[PDB]
């Protein structure tokens, strides 16, 4: 008869969440509808913004308030006066399925001091997410120093960052050559780890 969506696919980076899936090919304009259950109720409910959509995705971003417990999430398609049953995707838990990308790193300089400003652009506003405030004063950066020719190797942390723009003053070893350096996010210490940011390097006079 009508069938049901298919591939469906949840993928969570910076604290955007999107659900996705594939349909085939209907004469009719298949339009979907998909249901969220909270772990609260357990009990799946209309995700508002999804209802009667013809897009195969549905942003889950303002439905997703829990980091640590499972969300579930179903799809059904409808043509003409006919529906499809429900598909379900695979139990969601932002702590151990979301991602959090590389840092935007600025690196500069006063004298021989290197200064690090790193952060995450994407990362929604407080204001706008207020359940993300106690994620927030989880926030910390690992910082990866490299000095491309001594060898040497380092590594800094630093938290408690106002908006979450954390900045870090290295005073350099000595003194005339090229260091270069990475950052990672980190929620709760290693629960969450994003990924690393390429390398800037920057040259230090004597």
């Known amino acids: 008869a009508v069938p049901s969506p298919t591939g469906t696919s ?18 009719e304009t298949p339009h979907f509808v998909v249901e969220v259950k909270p772990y609260l109720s357990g009990k799946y409910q209309t995700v508002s913004t999804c209802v009667n959509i013809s897009a195969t995705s549905c942003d889950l971003s303002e439905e997703i308030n829990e980091i640590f417990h499972s969300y579930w999430f179903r799809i059904k398609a409808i043509v003409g006066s006919q529906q ?6 695979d139990e969601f838990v932002l702590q151990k399925h979301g991602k959090i990308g590389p840092p935007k790193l600025n690196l500069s300089r006063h004298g021989a ?7 995450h652009p994407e990362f929604p506003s407080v204001e706008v997410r207020p359940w993300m405030r106690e994620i927030y004063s989880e926030l910390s950066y ?35 050559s090229t260091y270069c350096v990475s950052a990672k996010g980190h929620f709760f210490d290693d629960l969450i780890v994003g990924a690393s940011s390429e390398e800037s390097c920057i040259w230090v006079p004597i």
């Open 10 to 27: 949840v993928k969570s980076k910076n604290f955007r969440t999107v659900l996705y899936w594939q349909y085939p090919s209907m004469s």
């Open 84 to 89: 499809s049953q429900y598909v379900e995707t």
């Open 113 to 119: 001091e290197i200064i690090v400003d790193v952060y």
């Open 142 to 176: 690992s910082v990866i120093f490299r000095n491309s020719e001594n060898e040497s190797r380092k590594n800094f942390t630093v938290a408690d960052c106002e908006m979450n723009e954390c900045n870090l003053s290295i005073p350099v070893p000595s003194e005339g």
